[model samples]
Target: SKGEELFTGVVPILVELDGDVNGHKFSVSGEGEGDATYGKLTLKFICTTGKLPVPWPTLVTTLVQCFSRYPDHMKRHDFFKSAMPEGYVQERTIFFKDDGNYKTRAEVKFEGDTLVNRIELKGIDFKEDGNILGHKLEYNYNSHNVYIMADKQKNGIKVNFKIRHNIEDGSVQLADHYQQNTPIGDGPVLLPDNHYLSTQSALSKDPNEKRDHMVLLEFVTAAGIT
Candidate 1:
């Protein structure tokens, strides 16, 4: 019990160290609850430098074997749920906490053709009561660019910009005619003929398109993205 003897008494604390282990200098340390069954009853392992006393590849293989047996145990903040059958769609919710209070929660799911992330925030402008909204991300097979519409009381704002992949001149720009470019809703504004046709183009090509096509047409018509 005096030196490195295993005993359920006071946790072995680092009294002193002079010689080196392997090639690196080391010491002992300990803290936290003292229960040998669950707490830190063992002496702490300390290293003098960032590099380990043993070869570095030993630590690499140690991690690889751990994840090999339990592949899903890798992510720190996310975990697997009860066994869900194959082909079953799983829904997940993520909560963002500010300090001790959880301020925002996002409900993520794919309902039909749309992939949605519905967000709810607990406070705005330091108000204890909060505001909530959703930022939807969807892939349009026919459309060239992603169109976004942010609505307030059903009236919304529309803007479109694109990224340039070309290394030469790497410059990107929005559509020139902003004022007359696209049909945007202010007071339940009607969809113009071109946008009306663009949205209708998808539906016309495929008569089997969802009855929700009318909704999508209105959404796509508002933004001017080339």
Candidate 2:
């Protein structure tokens, strides 16, 4: 009784933590309808695993090592004896919740011809319903800066934007028509699903030249340092 009571309180936690010792429940091999020869058979199993070697070449470890190994003068100045800063892609992400709703952010590092953190912004650090984040970030961008605006719809997010053109300073160029430089939709790119924003008679004029090439991307709380 003492053993059973102690195990009832603490065994589950121990098993959950270790996770290797599972399926150790006592069961009877042969028994009749109301018979009781079902005594516990102690289980004996051995397991061997090769511990994963520490990743010595990880970026975090490498950076820490570099800082530690630098000379005294270089350490004081910091950037003086640093690695060549011409270009190296480093990216990070941030996720949060607001008023029981979920949100995510990403930062894609672009130096010359490469793009980092380019993908669907799901998973990562999502919190389920009723969770709340500390703050809500507001959106801001130049009038000429084309951006994506997204509204969460039933099936998926509904995306749309107004591209303004012929402004004082030209906006980012796209493949199709040029934007009219409107201040609206001045956020990240939002590509609406065809099924949601479609109608037979809802027609709009064709854009100048910047068409499908325009893309919007939202960044995490920490914007790109560049």
Candidate 3:
């Protein structure tokens, strides 16, 4: 058996997820002078990768994204219902050791899979001495029905992304951008070279068919802070 499409049979999984986007749970209440519910979320499904050859549905979507989150919501769910693992705290710590500037984010949603799995890492840059100015993304989306509507299912939301910017190793693109139309009611939104990720059908409301988005990330110096 010289590497026959392989599957050595290995299993190990831990999880904890609770969702509801169109039914709630993707919350936001913290308003003003004494608001509350800043950002409520939960998720945990640690460990994966050991199928011997990577093929079992991409090793089960890369082992459900190697799970982790507790009040961290970034979006990434397909069949929902999580909560089988229970353990520690250092579950992928993103911030803490602060002084200013932050951007640790999360979002995972799975329940019939409609696309909304995000993860960003930005904090740490006491004026460029920590160099986290950008990069660390995993956003997958879907929903974009091509030619004729495939029977009016109203599809449009397809996007599978992955981005890393030389985690302080060096070279993270140093200027050569001029922008080309990427911004949708937010601040940082720049990524459009040729345009792609339009296939659709993760559930849709039709907002430009939720096309392919982009992000290249920049580089900075001073680098220190862990």
lDDT of 1 by residue, 1-226 (tens): 1111111232222211122322333232211112221212221222233333322111110110000011122112111111100101111121212211112232322233222223322222211221101111111212233233332343222323221111113322111111111212112222211211112112112356332111111111222322
Model 3, runs deviating above 4 Å: 1-92, 95-105, 118-125, 134-226
Better of 1 and 3 by TM-score: 3
* Per-residue lDDT of model 3, residues 12-66, tens digit only: 2222222221122211111111000221112222212211111111111111221
In model 1, residue pairs whose N, Cα or C atoms come closer than 3 Å (at least 3 residues apart or on different chains), thus clashing, are none
Clashes within 3 Å, all models in order: 0, 21, 31
Candidate 2, residues 1-226, lDDT tens digits: the string is 1111111111100000011111111111111110001111111111112221111010010010011122222222112112111212211222222222111222222223221222112122222221111111111122222122223332112223222112223422111211111111223222222211111111121245232111111111101112
Off by over 4 Å in 1: 1-102, 124-226
Q: Looking at model 1, report the run of 10 residues with the lowest lDDT sum.
A: 60-69
